[PDB]
Every structure is written in C-alpha cells, then in structure tokens.
C-alpha cells in the first residue's frame, strides 16, 4: 500500500574543490567536509564547518604527516 521511507536531504556538494598542484588565490576553498577528514597545514585555515581554505596565494599540497598519518592540506606560497 504505502511505505514509511521516501525521504532524503539535499546533496551538500562536499569534497575537494582544488586538487594537488592547483594555483589558488587566498580565501579559495580547497575542501568542504564534515569534520577534519583533511587537516589544515601551512597557509590553510579551517572554517567553522571544517572547510579548509587558502590563507595565501600558492599551490595546493596534500601531505600525510605526524604520528596518526593524518592528511594535511597546505599552500606552497
């Protein structure tokens, strides 16, 4: 007859906006994410929704770093 499902939320367009080696202007969003899947490295800020954004003009650099092998995003300015 009827079903109790049939709901879903709008897709949030998360994920990587600027990949490795891409030249960005300061302020450019590099990744939108839920929590810190990626962490802010050098010249990268972490917004209130865990958005990583460039704090300097330069090139995006993904790196695995530290004792937990966490993924950091940096900007090579």
């Amino acid at each position: 007859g009827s079903t109790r499902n049939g709901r879903d939320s709008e897709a949030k367009r998360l994920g990587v906006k600027r990949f490795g080696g891409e030249s960005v202007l300061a302020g450019s969003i590099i990744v939108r994410q839920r929590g810190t899947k990626f962490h802010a490295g050098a010249n990268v800020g972490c917004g209130r929704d865990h958005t990583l954004f460039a704090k300097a003009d330069g090139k995006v650099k993904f790196e695995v770093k530290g004792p937990k092998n966490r993924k950091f995003i940096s900007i090579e300015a």
Binding site: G1, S2, T3, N5
Partner: protein, 136 residues
C-alpha cells in the same frame, strides 16, 4: 531451516552473483560437495539436501554445512501492482559461485560419502561435484 537470528536490515538489494567462490577446499571433513554452477541456494534446498545426505549415512560420521542463507529474498503478493514499496521477505538464500564447497563430511567411507552427496545433489538447483581433502 537456516536463517540469520538477527540482521541489521530486513531487506537487501538484489545485487549480482559474479566471480568464483571463496571456500574452495575441504577445510573441515574428508569429503566435500562442491558447486560447479552459479546460483542461489534457498534454506529449504539446503535443508532438503542435508536431510538426504544425513539419512544416507544413518547418523554416522559428521556433516558440515559451509554455506549459510543470509540473503533475504522479497516477493510481491499476487494481484498487486508494481511499486508501492519493496515486497516482503519470503525466504533466505545463499549466493553460490563455482568452486564453493557446500557440504563436507568425515567419518564415513568415500563410497558412502559419494552416495550420500549424490542423494543430496539431486535436491539442489546447481551442478555439483564430489571433492576430497587435499594435502595442499
């Protein structure tokens, strides 16, 4: 007949049944009944085949069932249209790939294992073959 005691979810996507089996060796007993074909074994079929081979051995030796029917199969009732939600779970199946050892047996002669498994095989929808434990 076999069925998961619990599941996280009631209903499962149809899926596909590609690939060759994992669990291709006689790992427990001396003798095994192996799938050559691909398909679904229902819990009723698994039970029918189990009762056949068990009766053949006259409750002697030991029987393992290597497959478990953990996939719920839904059906729509008669005279209902398409849509209006997924059908109700009616039975459980194990997906079989070629090479899957279905049953194993120990503590009988090979002759009697071969007969017991022949009687079991006649209950199953898939082509089977008798196999023996290998040293490697």
């Amino acid at each position: 007949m076999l069925q998961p005691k619990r599941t996280k979810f009631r209903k499962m996507h149809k899926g596909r049944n590609r690939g060759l089996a994992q669990g291709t060796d006689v790992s427990f007993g001396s003798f095994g009944l192996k799938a050559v074909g691909r398909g679904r074994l229902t819990a009723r079929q698994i039970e029918a085949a189990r009762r056949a081979m068990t009766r053949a051995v006259k409750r002697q030796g030991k029987i393992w069932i290597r497959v478990f029917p953990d996939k719920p199969i839904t059906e729509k009732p008669l005279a209902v249209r398409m849509g209006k939600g997924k059908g109700n779970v009616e039975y459980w199946v194990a997906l079989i790939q070629p090479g899957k050892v279905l049953y194993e047996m120990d503590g009988v002669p090979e002759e009697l294992a071969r007969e017991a498994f022949k009687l079991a095989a006649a209950k199953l929808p898939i082509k089977t073959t008798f196999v023996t434990k290998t040293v490697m």
